[PDB]
Amino acid sequence: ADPAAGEKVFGKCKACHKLDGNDGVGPHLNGVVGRTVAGVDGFNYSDPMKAHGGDWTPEALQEFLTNPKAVVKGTKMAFAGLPKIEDRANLIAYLEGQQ
Numbered sequence: 001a002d003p004a005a006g007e008k009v010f011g012k013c014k015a016c017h018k019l020d021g022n023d024g025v026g027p028h029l030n031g032v033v034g035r036t037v038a039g040v041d042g043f044n045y046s047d048p049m050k051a052h053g054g055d056w057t058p059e060a061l062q063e064f065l066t067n068p069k070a071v072v073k074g075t076k077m078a079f080a081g082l083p084k085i086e087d088r089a090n091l092i093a094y095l096e097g098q099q
């Protein structure tokens with residue numbers, strides 16, 4: 001629930017994601033909470049991501065951020081994961097502020 005702490009955790013995402021609407025290694029993450037999974041038009045998602053379905057609910061997001069390949073097997077997102085629930089919670093709060 002701490003957006004300020006979440007901002008710091010986002011430092012682990014900035015190498016591939018932006019919050020300014022621009023897509024790069026990964027799709028822009030501004031407005032990602034509750035967003036259709038694989039919903040950014042034009043971004044070249046992996047087949048597993050496109051087949052996942054549903055939305056990026058806070059729960060779906062926290063699980064994915066703990067272990068990306070366990071939630072979306074075969075994803076092209078090469079991030080090891082955030083093992084601490086507090087870090088995931090704070091990051092999600094930060095993302096929610098950037099909706």
Ligand code: HEC
Nearest residue numbers: 012013016025026027037038045046049075076077078079
């Ligand atoms: C590059 C080395 C990455 C790092 C570090 C992080 N992410 Fe990522 N992410 C990356 C790619 C290439 C992709 C597409 C994956 C695919 O299989 O197509 C993604 C995707 C996401 C998504 C899905 C977004 C959607 O529009 O469906 C999310 C929610 C996401 N990434 C979140 C995220 C966060 C919060 C990170 C820091 C903890 C993070 N990613 C790091 C590449 C990379």
